[PDB]
Design a protein around this nucleic acid. Structure first.
Ligand SMILES: [Mg+2]
Ligand SMILES: [Mg+2]
Ligand SMILES: [Mg+2]
Ligand SMILES: [Mg+2]
Ligand SMILES: [Mg+2]
Ligand SMILES: [Mg+2]
Lengths: 175, 190, 138, 199
RNA sequence: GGAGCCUCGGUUGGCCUCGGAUAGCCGGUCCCCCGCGGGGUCCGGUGCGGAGUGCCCUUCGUCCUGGGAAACGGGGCGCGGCCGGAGAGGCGGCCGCCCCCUCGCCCGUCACGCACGCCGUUCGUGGGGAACCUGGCGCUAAACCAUUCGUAGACGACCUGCU
RNA sequence: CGUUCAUAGCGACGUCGCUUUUUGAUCCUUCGAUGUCGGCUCUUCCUAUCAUUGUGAAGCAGAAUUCACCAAGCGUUGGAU
RNA sequence: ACCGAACGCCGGGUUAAGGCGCCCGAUGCCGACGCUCAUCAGACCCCAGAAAAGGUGUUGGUUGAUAUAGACAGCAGGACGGUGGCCAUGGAAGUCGGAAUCCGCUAAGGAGUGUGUAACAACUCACCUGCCGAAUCAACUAGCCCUGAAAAUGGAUGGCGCU
RNA sequence: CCGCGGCGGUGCGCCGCGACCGGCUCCGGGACGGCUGGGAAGGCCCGGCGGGGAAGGUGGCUCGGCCGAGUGUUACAGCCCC
């Protein structure tokens, strides 16, 4: 499993109809994946973990991308994690602050790869829940809960160093 | 993580005049001037109130190693205000078993000669830091008084004559000899 | 020592990106390096935008941190950031740089002749000031 | 046709890569004031790096072996020589093109010098990190002439202060002359601001 | 002042503050100190830098005559004087004097082998090295071999003496 | 174990590592030859430091002696077999 | 011997594996998010070097508590009585050690954590009050870095170097 | 011989241009389908309903000139959000 910018796919599936059971139950998951092919692959992975169902012994009924119901509203997201270390598998709970669920899960994959070297094949997303201003347990998220937030951009180091590279003025950083 | 703001205020009394050229603060008052250059410390130093009643120090978007510097800037400002108003007086006693340690100042308090430490013949000359006055006090047998404004200079000058009188190649748990710092206070109490 | 702060209501100038060279009202703060951005009369949609590609100005206007485009459009039109931005010296030298980029070759020839004659007249005046200052110091 | 780069505040390898590329591209570069070059990482790290470089020497004949140049200009020449293909004729021509100086000589003190922000400490290092001056590094390795260079730079800073005072006097004469003439160059000044000047 | 060989790079120049990066640039200095200048306090103008290397400076067709705005400016590697520059100077400014010109921006007036579409145009350059030539001033040798010495030495080399 | 006290100095029952200064193990180079051991002379290098410089800990009162660090700069002898 | 890919002589285009500071062709993206300070940093299968253990160095996670019934460290009153209880006589009125192992005053002392004794005595730790008044404590666990970690010619992420 | 009148190989060398084809690599436009028969958004707001950060208030304090700024306290909607 690799990553790009992630997308959220509602994938439902069931088993093939048999003479012993003509109407199998339908199972739904919310797979975070770059595209729908690997979304269906991770769906078969988690359903093969949970229930007795393989890809040849079943079918995906519908795989479709679900979109953010309010993309313009900033939200807190609590994501439950089951990852694998160099030692045995560990469980975590992370909180992020982003517009979309798939964006928060993307930030979660980059943050797990940055902090703990948890790769996308070792990370199993349990579930993501949107959170109000309360019910938050992380100070890096709770420091942005302010009615009148106020901070400068103190050491605003400049970029565009190489368009004209040789200059007379030493560059400024107080802006 | 990066903490969005760590602020701290220092309320200066009316006997103190402080100002700042960027991160270079200067504190003048009764006993003299004291300057300190807080460049390469990388904080914000605002100075507010009518007639500059308080010095406010900010750290914006700093993690733990730079959040640990706001209170040390505040502590250096407290020590500098204390050195300007009340001064620093360090008392240090000459502890000896048999040989009485002879201490004599030479110019005013600048050069200090230490003699008869463990019966040695080598005299110990110590130059004090510029601004630290050494004296032999009254109503006490063998005791040195270091007066000054800068706590850095006064305590470094105390550490020099404390480390000059050390016992070599013996059991220092038995040979308890030397000039040791006993009291740390001010010149005037107010 | 700071004067420009990331406040709800801060007007900023986009340096680079899709909406480059346009004004921005900061509505909310999302992260350390990402903000929530509206552009009501500057043809910029509501989206998130990092602090790297925006240069914050000294204009502030009053609206609460989750305004649904209407109250921030009314605050923009009430504070009148468009005419004040046109009267701002920095946008005047931005459009001076734009005129310098749009300078045609015939326009550049006219500018060069005006440079030549203006520099000759000002240099003669500088020489008269130098000889007058020499006579004054004499 | 000749770049004059200042070594003040510029990082060692960050400046040396740009200098090596611009000299291989056929351009005369004069890098000057090379004792003001600062190296990231603090002084004990950089000092033990150069002391290990001093320990690397030929056992049988050290005069035949590695030449350990102590001056900061020749340290900068060495760190550009380690980036140039100096075993070839174009690399030797690049070493002939490059001219490196300690302090700043009278052929180059009255020249406008350039600053590279892509190799500068304020742009490249975080302000909470540490660094070490190549002048202090060279003086505590064994370079002899920090103090003579300091006195000569003090003399030329006094001379440059006199020159900048004269430049400010010429500039106030220029501004008061523009104030006098802006009534008779009314249609000469306007035809520059309608095309993008003086605004 | 002259062709003539060889080797090449080029294709306006920038003639300068130190300095900070959680700050900085510019004024008069009503106020104060120090040796006309510097420094400190207050105040005022900009600061993604227009007192901008995203910059500045020079025009890069010619000459004729006949008007307007501006100007007493430029030249004869102009002659004499005052200097400054030493880190690896090798250049620049200021005065007295003889003569000549209408150069910079707009306009009326024509003419310049207008070589009939075809590529190495332009120049830093009176480019660097060698051989012939126009004159004025200034000049007169040193080293090595041979001899001698022994403070030196395998030979060379080194220290010496000789109108 | 150390008068009490695991760790001043040691440390069982177990376990983790470094070295090619010893012997093993293999046969990868050399059998149209790489002179096979010691001693004498001589130079350089390593630290896993015996002594000297600077230090910390002792069951360091002084003397003497152990443990440990920075450290190879300078030393490490004359002999009977 | 690894990855890619198999080969007539060439031109244009496109890639694999690898890379895009300079050597060295290309990130001279105004690249995104974090981690990391190393007085032995680290830098890409084979492959050319490292372990057990430890670290409030720093970044996260898991579990369990308490804080207005007024925390945590910080100045401060105490470890009494049945009880020299009980085997240990060679000595245990807490004391080399082991089966035991609660009441009273109660605010409170566990038949006790150490300093130390042929035995004592004495110094001294659960709990709370007087003062500062809101986030704190404890154990595991995963990243990067450090100790562990010492070889002989001067030495190698390939070099320069890089924060 | 004057004709480059028609055909054919062409020119001593250095070249340039035009149009057409094959292989490529890029750019500027125009309009179309599906979706959760797309999600939120842009405009006028209407008659109700509940909850929550905390505002032309109330209000302990602080900083200044009846007024402005910061902090905390119950919290309606005349700041807003679902
Ligand atoms: Mg002793
Ligand atoms: Mg042989
Ligand atoms: Mg041999
Ligand atoms: Mg050692
Ligand atoms: Mg013998
Ligand atoms: Mg394979």
């Amino acid at each position: 499993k690799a990553s790009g910018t992630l997308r959220e796919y509602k994938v439902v599936g069931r088993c093939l109809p048999t003479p012993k059971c003509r109407t199998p139950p339908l199972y739904r998951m919310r797979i975070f994946a770059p595209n729908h092919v690997v979304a269906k692959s991770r769906f078969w992975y988690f359903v093969s973990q949970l229930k007795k169902m393989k890809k040849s012994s079943g079918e995906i009924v519908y795989c479709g991308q679900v979109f953010e119901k309010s993309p313009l509203r900033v939200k807190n997201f609590g994501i439950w994690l089951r990852y694998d270390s160099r030692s045995g598998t560990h469980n975590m709970y992370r909180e992020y602050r982003d517009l979309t669920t798939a964006g928060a899960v993307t930030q979660c994959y980059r943050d797990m790869g940055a902090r703990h070297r948890a790769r996308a094949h070792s990370i199993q997303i349990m579930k993501v829940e949107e959170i109000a201003a309360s019910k938050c347990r992380r100070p890096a998220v709770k420091q942005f809960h302010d009615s009148k937030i106020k901070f400068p951009l103190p050491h605003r180091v400049l970029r565009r160093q190489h368009k004209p590279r040789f200059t007379t003025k030493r560059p400024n950083t107080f802006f | 993580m990066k903490t969005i703001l760590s602020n701290q205020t220092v309320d200066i009394p009316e006997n103190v005049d402080i100002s700042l050229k960027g991160r270079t603060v200067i504190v003048k008052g009764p006993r003299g001037t004291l300057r300190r250059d807080f460049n390469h410390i990388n904080v914000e130093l605002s100075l507010l109130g009518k007639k500059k009643k308080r010095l406010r120090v900010d750290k914006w978007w700093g993690n733990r190693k730079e959040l640990a510097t706001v209170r040390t800037i505040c502590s250096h400002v407290q020590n500098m205000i204390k050195g300007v108003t009340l001064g620093f007086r360090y008392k240090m006693r000459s502890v000896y078993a048999h040989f009485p340690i002879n201490v004599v100042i030479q110019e005013n308090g600048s050069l200090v000669e230490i003699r008869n430490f463990l019966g040695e013949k080598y005299i110990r000359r110590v130059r004090m830091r510029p601004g630290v006055a050494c004296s032999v006090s009254q109503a006490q047998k063998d005791e040195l008084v270091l007066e000054g404004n800068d706590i850095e200079l006064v305590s470094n000058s105390a550490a020099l004559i404390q480390q000059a009188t050390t016992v070599k190649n013996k059991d220092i748990r038995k040979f308890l000899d030397g000039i040791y710092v006993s009291e740390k206070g001010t010149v005037q109490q107010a | 020592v700071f004067r420009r702060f990331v406040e709800v209501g801060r007007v900023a100038y986009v340096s680079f990106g899709p909406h480059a060279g346009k004004l921005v009202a900061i509505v909310d703060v999302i992260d350390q390096n990402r903000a929530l951005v509206d552009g009501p009369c500057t043809r910029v949609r509501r989206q998130a935008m990092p602090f790297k590609c925006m240069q914050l100005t000294d204009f502030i206007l009053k609206f609460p941190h989750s305004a649904r485009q209407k109250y921030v459009r009314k605050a923009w039109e009430k504070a009148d950031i468009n005419t004040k931005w046109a009267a701002t010296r920095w946008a005047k030298k931005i459009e001076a740089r734009e005129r310098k980029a749009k300078m045609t070759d015939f326009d550049r020839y006219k500018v060069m002749k005006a440079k030549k004659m203006r520099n000759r007249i000002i240099k003669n005046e500088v020489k008269k000031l130098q000889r007058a200052a020499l006579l004054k110091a004499s | 046709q000749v770049l004059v780069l200042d070594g003040r505040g510029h990082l060692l390898g960050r400046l040396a890569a740009i200098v090596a590329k611009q000299v291989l591209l056929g351009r005369k570069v004069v890098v000057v004031r090379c004792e003001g070059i600062n190296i990231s990482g603090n002084f004990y790290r950089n000092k033990l790096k150069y002391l290990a470089f001093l320990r690397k020497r030929m056992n049988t004949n050290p005069s035949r072996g590695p030449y350990h140049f102590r001056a900061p200009s020749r340290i900068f020449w060495r760190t550009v020589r380690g980036m140039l293909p100096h075993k070839t004729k174009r690399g030797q021509a690049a070493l002939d093109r490059l001219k490196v100086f300690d302090g700043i000589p009278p052929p180059y003190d009255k020249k406008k010098r350039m600053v590279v922000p892509a190799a500068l400490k304020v742009v490249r290092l975080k302000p909470t990190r540490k660094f070490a001056y190549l002048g202090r590094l060279a003086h505590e390795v064994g370079w002899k002439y920090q103090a003579v260079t300091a006195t000569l730079e003090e003399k030329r800073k006094e001379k440059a202060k006199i020159h900048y005072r004269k430049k400010k006097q010429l500039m106030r004469l220029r501004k008061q002359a523009e104030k006098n003439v802006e009534k008779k160059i009314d249609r000469f000044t306007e035809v520059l601001k309608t095309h993008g000047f003086l605004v």
